[PDB]
Scaffold this active site. Structure first.
Site, short mmCIF file in Angstrom:
data_model
loop_
_atom_site.label_atom_id
_atom_site.label_comp_id
_atom_site.label_asym_id
_atom_site.label_seq_id
_atom_site.Cartn_x
_atom_site.Cartn_y
_atom_site.Cartn_z
N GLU B 131 62.50 16.24 46.77
CA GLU B 131 61.83 14.96 46.91
C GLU B 131 62.82 13.85 46.64
O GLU B 131 62.63 12.71 47.08
CB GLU B 131 60.64 14.89 45.94
CG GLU B 131 59.55 15.89 46.30
CD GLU B 131 58.34 15.87 45.35
OE1 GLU B 131 57.59 14.85 45.34
OE2 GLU B 131 58.16 16.91 44.63
N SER B 132 63.87 14.16 45.89
CA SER B 132 64.93 13.19 45.63
C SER B 132 65.63 12.78 46.95
O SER B 132 65.72 13.59 47.89
CB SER B 132 65.97 13.77 44.67
OG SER B 132 66.93 12.78 44.38
N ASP B 320 68.75 5.53 51.97
CA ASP B 320 67.61 5.89 52.80
C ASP B 320 67.43 7.38 52.72
O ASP B 320 68.40 8.13 52.80
CB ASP B 320 67.83 5.45 54.25
CG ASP B 320 68.07 3.95 54.36
OD1 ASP B 320 67.14 3.16 54.08
OD2 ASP B 320 69.21 3.56 54.72
N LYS B 321 66.19 7.84 52.53
CA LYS B 321 65.92 9.28 52.49
C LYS B 321 66.38 10.05 53.74
O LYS B 321 66.80 11.21 53.65
CB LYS B 321 64.44 9.55 52.22
CG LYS B 321 64.20 10.94 51.61
CD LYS B 321 62.92 10.95 50.81
CE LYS B 321 62.73 12.27 50.07
NZ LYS B 321 61.35 12.25 49.45
N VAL B 322 66.24 9.42 54.92
CA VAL B 322 66.77 9.96 56.17
C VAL B 322 67.57 8.87 56.84
O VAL B 322 67.10 7.72 56.97
CB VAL B 322 65.66 10.43 57.15
CG1 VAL B 322 66.26 11.05 58.44
CG2 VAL B 322 64.73 11.42 56.44
#
Lengths: 320, 333
Positions: B131-132, B320-322
């Site tokens: 989730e990180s 940004d996560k992605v």
């Protein structure tokens, strides 16, 4: 100061490089598969030389000498037809030692007739003299001489050294502006960005920052920086974006850094207005020669940041 | 904090990795010439996978996906028999973009069935959940999963997942000692050092410092640091030297850093008195699996440095996560 004088000798260094090339061009025929070995700046130069080898339809591989010494199994060496050893002094122990392990034809690139040149089948001595501990115009000079040699060996047309030299003159004209940037913006770290042949330039510029200014400096392939590395860019960061051709992704990338409050120096071969804080344009050259005028720009930037910090770039702490 | 939890999940990731491998081993045979494509952590993973391909007698090449998109002629790509795309989400736009330009067979490595897996011929899906924004145990799990697939493809003995997992259990038992280093030395920068397979671990570690701790971190092939780079190490620097085998050149290097007033953390598979300030011994493994226990350790060190600076590694500033781009420049219809 030697470092600055030597950076400014860049145009004359290109001419010397063409002379050195001409002296050896019928003695040395570069094959398609070449391994390049160097340390520090000369490793980043090895990377650059490997890249142009690929760009001209060969197979170029570079690794640091100590990785070749202790971990060669991990690297795609294959069966090189020539191994190139690079050392400005020609006395770098690790280069001598790596080459002693090799029975393949060898070429040595140095500024001096030296242990290195005397230990190889072939030698390309580019007599750009530097008294600074930090390599400046020699990087650029070695690169140009090898560029011509590669082009000659592969039956490509030669470049016009006067034209290349002139490009570096035009780059050196930005000296007073570069001074101004260093005065205007008291940056606390710096990220150099470039793609392809400008990547090793980024790596080398970042090393100039470390050696000359004992400074926090980073270097990445242009768009790779977005993938986590950009976290360290803020209001005290200068981002030095180097690109030969610019497109919409560079505009977005400048804007993303500006959004984190970083300032951006865009160095390019082409005029492009992306709202960058600072702009330097250098003359357009052939694809392979393109990186050459970027070098004295980043060398000058590094030099002036070291002087601003009260440091002497001619003889940095801890360095031989 | 999700990032700590996810680092601690490293053993369980090894088992899951072994199971993803077992699911595909009879469907995918890896060839000798392989290109590896990733970005960020997945690029450093790509470098590791390229290295083990070379070690096992193949030809492995890795580059960042954007370098493949815009500067591929600069790299010793050749004519690979397989291209491997790597993305934890499976949604990293640059991975899809690069793969779309490739006609050779393709293998996707992801934590999810995703655009990436749909766009490849074959897929190695390793369901480590993170989730990180910061990738931790997924790096190590994808690595172990692919290592099995290579040995299987190359008719080599398989590694014992259970032993690899216990190796990382032992590494993680250093958590307390790791905090103590952080509590002990208010270091202002860190240099990670490693040779061969430990060099991508050094790059990855230094990336964890950037992402988690927003911190000045550098990474070098061990002895390459001597050539100018060492200039930035002084009394405020922690040097993290990682080495399977330890020799006399390692001793001189430690002392060279000591002479600059830096402090040295030595992570190795042995216990030797080289003058270092801190010491961490990790379980010895097969040579290809050797880096695996080092990863949890440098992830913990980055995590604890982040927390000591008051930062949140689950959601670092700006990140940004992605990492994405517009994929299609014109929506065709």
């Amino acid at each position: 100061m030697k470092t600055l004088t030597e950076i400014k000798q860049t145009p004359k260094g290109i001419i010397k490089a063409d002379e050195s090339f001409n002296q050896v061009k019928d003695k040395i025929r570069l094959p398609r598969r070449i391994l390049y070995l160097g340390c520090g700046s000369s490793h980043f130069l090895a990377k650059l030389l490997a890249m142009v080898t690929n760009m001209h339809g060969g197979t170029g591989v570079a690794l640091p000498c100590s990785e070749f010494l202790y971990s060669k199994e991990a690297y795609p060496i294959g069966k090189p037809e020539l191994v190139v050893g690079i050392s400005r002094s020609g006395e770098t122990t690790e280069v001598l030692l790596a080459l002693e392990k090799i029975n393949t034809p060898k070429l040595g690139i140095s500024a001096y007739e030296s242990s290195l040149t005397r230990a190889c089948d072939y030698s390309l001595v580019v007599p750009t003299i530097e008294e600074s501990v930090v390599m400046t115009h020699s990087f650029t000079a070695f690169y140009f001489a090898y560029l011509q040699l590669l082009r000659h060996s592969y039956g490509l047309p030669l470049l016009e050294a006067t034209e290349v030299a002139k490009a570096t003159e035009k780059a050196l004209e930005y000296e007073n502006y570069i001074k101004e940037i260093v005065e205007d913006f008291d940056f606390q770290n710096v990220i150099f960005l470039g793609s392809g042949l400008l990547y090793p330039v980024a790596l080398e510029a970042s090393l100039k920052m470390k050696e000359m200014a004992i400074f926090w400096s980073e270097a990445y392939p242009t768009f790779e920086v977005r993938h986590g590395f950009k976290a360290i860019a803020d209001e005290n960061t200068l981002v030095v974006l180097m690109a030969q051709e610019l497109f919409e992704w560079h505009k977005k990338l400048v804007n993303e850094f500006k959004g984190q409050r970083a300032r951006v120096l865009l160095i390019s071969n082409s005029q492009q207005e992306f709202g960058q804080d600072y702009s330097i344009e250098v003359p357009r050259l052939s694809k392979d020669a393109t990186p050459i005028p970027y070098l004295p720009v980043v060398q000058l930037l590094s030099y002036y940041k070291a002087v601003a910090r009260g440091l002497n770039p001619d003889n940095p702490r801890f360095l031989d």
